Amino acid sequence: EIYRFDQFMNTDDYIWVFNTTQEGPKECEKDKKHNMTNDKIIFVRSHQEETKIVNETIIGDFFHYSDNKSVYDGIYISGDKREVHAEHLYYSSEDMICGLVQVFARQTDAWTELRVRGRRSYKSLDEVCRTQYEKYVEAIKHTKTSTSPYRDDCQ
Ligand SMILES: [Cl-]
C-alpha cells in the first residue's frame, strides 16, 4: 500500500538504475547515501563516461507526493545535472531491495526508473516490481524506450 522513499534510501549500499525510460541515460547510474535526517538526505549520484566516474552531490527534501501526509513518497532534488526536480516512489518491495521511481525533470520531462539496492541478478528481483515495470514498458514502447544503464563491470 505504502512506499516510504525515506526508508527506501535508508541504506549504506549503492542503489543502481537497472532500467530507465529516460531518453539519454548515462551508464552506471547509482546513488550512495552520505547522511540523512528525518526530512532530508544528502547522497551522491554518479554515472560513468566510458572509464571515468562522475559524482554529483544531491540535496533531497522528502515530501508528500500523494494526499497521504503520513508517508514520505516524494523527494525534491537539487544538484542533478539532468535537471531532475522531483522523484516519486510509486512501488517498493517489502524488503525495499527493488523500487519503481517516477522522475520529473526540467519543466515537462518525466521518465521511470527501476532502482535496485545492491548488485544482484534481474531475475532475483521482486516479481511485482519486475512485472509492473515490464507491463508499463511494453505499453509505451511505440514512443518511449526502456534501456539498462547498468553493466556488471560498472565501478
Ligand atoms: Cl527523457
Residue numbers in the entry: 48 to 59, 59a, 60 to 152, 156 to 172, 174 to 191, 191a, 191b, 192 to 203
Source paper text:
Using this strategy, we were able to purify CirpA1, A3, A4, and A5 and determine their structure using X-ray crystallography to a resolution of 2.0, 2.1, 1.8, and 1.9 Å respectively. Overall, the structures appear very similar, with the biggest conformational differences in the tilt angle of the C-terminal helix H2 as well as variations in loops between beta strands 4 and 5 (L4-5) and between strands 7 and 8 (L7-8). We identified three regions with high conformational variability between homologs. This pocket is incomplete in all three CirpA1 homolog structures.
Functional and structural characterisation reveals that members of the CirpA family directly bind to properdin, inhibiting its ability to promote complement activation, and leading to potent inhibition of the complement response in a species specific manner.
